[PDB]
Amino acid sequence: ALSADSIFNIVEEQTFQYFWDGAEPVSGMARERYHVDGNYPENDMNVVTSGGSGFGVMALLVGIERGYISREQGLERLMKIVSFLEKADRFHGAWPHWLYGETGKVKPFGQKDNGGDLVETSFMIQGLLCVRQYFANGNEQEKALAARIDQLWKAVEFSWYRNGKNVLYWHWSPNYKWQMNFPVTGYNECLIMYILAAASPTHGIPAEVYHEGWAKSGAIKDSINAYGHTLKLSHNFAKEYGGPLFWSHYSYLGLDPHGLKDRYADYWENNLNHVLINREWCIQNPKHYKGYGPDSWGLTASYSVKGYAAHAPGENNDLGVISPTAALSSMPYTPEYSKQAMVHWYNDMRTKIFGKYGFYDAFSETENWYPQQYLAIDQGPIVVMMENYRSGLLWKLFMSCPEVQAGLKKLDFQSPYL
């Protein structure tokens, strides 16, 4: 029976290994998935994911900082990644969701999603900007990396994805054009795309794209009340309890939500309340699933008993599946509650739910379902948020970008970093 502190470092280190020992070997990029038993129904073990690899380059910086790898080891790996990303398919400067690791060519995420994915590109840029800042004051080779990252950053054509409108579209294809037809309106996980779009010095957006598009001219404001907690953001399709918990993770890995506010919300309090509602649902456990309680909580999108599902509170959304990234990546918001789950899982369940790349993606005690499987997009925010809770690493780096601060000012945000 180990201490939280011992467990914390074991979990952080092993989770980081998804992105190191687990990386696709040619590219260095994060695999979409890793299945311990070697069985890949889609034969896609070496398909890498642009968004999750953004998480992973952050994780590499955690690795250098915690001594998991040397500074030099980290640098050479990031160099390899950036080389790959310089030759990979880009679609008005945005990477696709999926790439073949060995070649850097697109794998369509469904037939018509065969071009750019601006949302996944934004998670890659959040992470690559942290790397730019980390190296900006090092040696000749570190600065040339920082510059090549700056170049990739500046070539993302955020404005292209407006398609002439006051909003950003998620996708664009060479041949299918705008047929995916997903204009990105809030609230969902995608805030960082609009912030980066405003920040871009070469291909930015005017403020109306954010206010009329993301914010729906104010219709993003809501009042979702559960367990005595209020969300003031209109969580898309989740007006009872808020969405899957990762919405309070992905856009907040670099962007620091502490003290972040604008006319639509106080992001700290809304992110926190999102977590506390999620946890409370698991404590009340209305569907009477096995294992739900204060030592085992957190619903988010992940592998599921019948495949993959966007788990969340509500009788229609909670499938008896707990996914560790929900509670663990919530460490900066709810450290003691996130540690409570982490400790129970490690001390009492590790032989079922803990593996070489940290805790597995999802489990159901109701169904005795304990797949030895992992997803980049679930492991990455665990490593990153655990380190943010510890030291602020990625927040410090990201928030230091002059362009991030300008973009936040342009969109009428408040934050101490400004």
Ligand X SMILES: OC[C@H]1O[C@@H](O[C@H]2[C@H](O[C@@H]3[C@@H](O)[C@H](O)[C@@H](CO)O[C@H]3O)O[C@H](CO)[C@@H](O)[C@@H]2O)[C@H](O)[C@@H](O)[C@@H]1O
**221 beta partners:** 233
Q: What are phi and psi for residue 354, nearest 5 degrees?
A: -120, 130
Among the listed residues 37, 38, 43, 402, the single contact to K ion using CB under 5 A: 43
Partner whose footprint covers residue 33, from ligand BGC, ligand X, K ion, none (CB < 5 to 8 Å by kind) = ligand BGC
| Residue 377 within binding range of ligand BGC, rule CB under 6 A | yes
DSSP characters over 203-239: T---HHIIIIIITGGGTTEEEEEETTEEEEE--TT-T
Among the listed residues 255, 299, 331, 375, the single contact to ligand BGC using CB under 6 A: 375
Report CA-CA distances (Å) from 254 to 125, 135, 358, 404: 10, 16, 22, 10
Q: Binding residues for ligand BGC, how many (CB under 6 A)?
A: 5
Partner whose footprint covers residue 391, from K ion, ligand X, ligand BGC, none (CB < 5 to 8 Å by kind) = none
Question: What is the contact mask toward ligand X in residues 64 to 103, using x (rule: CB under 6 A)?
Answer: ---------------------------------x------
Q: Is the peptide bond before 389 cis (omega within 30 degrees of 0)?
A: no
Rounded Cα–Cα distance for residues 188 and 191 (Å): 7
Question: What is the contact mask toward ligand X in residues 204 to 243, using x (rule: CB under 6 A)?
Answer: --------------------------------xx------
Question: Encoding tokens for residue 340?
Answer: 């409570």
Which region among 181-189, 355-363, 379-387, 406-414 touches ligand X (by CB under 6 A)?
A: 181-189
Minimum distance, C-beta of residue 241 to ligand BGC, in the bound complex (Å): 22
**224 beta partners:** 231
Q: Which is nearer to ligand X, 113 or 361 (CB)?
A: 113
Q: What are phi and psi for residue 110, nearest 5 degrees?
A: 90, 150
| Residue 182 within binding range of ligand BGC, rule CB under 6 A | no
Rounded Cα–Cα distance for residues 247 and 72 (Å): 34
Partner whose footprint covers residue 158, from ligand BGC, ligand X, K ion, none (CB < 5 to 8 Å by kind) = none
Question: Encoding tokens for residue 151?
Answer: 């170049």
Q: Which is nearer to ligand X, 236 or 400 (CB)?
A: 236
| Residue 308 within binding range of ligand BGC, rule CB under 6 A | yes
- For residue 321, what is the DSSP state? -
Q: Are 290 and 260 in contact (CB under 8 A)?
A: no
Partner whose footprint covers residue 113, from K ion, ligand X, ligand BGC, none (CB < 5 to 8 Å by kind) = ligand X
Q: Which is nearer to ligand X, 74 or 243 (CB)?
A: 243
Report CA-CA distances (Å) from 155 to 70, 95, 122, 152, 269: 30, 11, 12, 5, 34
Question: Encoding tokens for residue 12?
Answer: 């952080």
Question: Encoding tokens for residue 52?
Answer: 């999750």
Rounded Cα–Cα distance for residues 76 and 190 (Å): 30
| Residue 308 within binding range of ligand X, rule CB under 6 A | no
Q: Interface with ligand X by CB under 6 A: which residues?
A: 97, 109, 113, 170, 182, 188-189, 236-237
Q: Interface with ligand BGC by CB under 6 A: which residues?
A: 32-33, 308, 375, 377
Q: Interface with K ion by CB under 5 A: which residues?
A: 40, 43
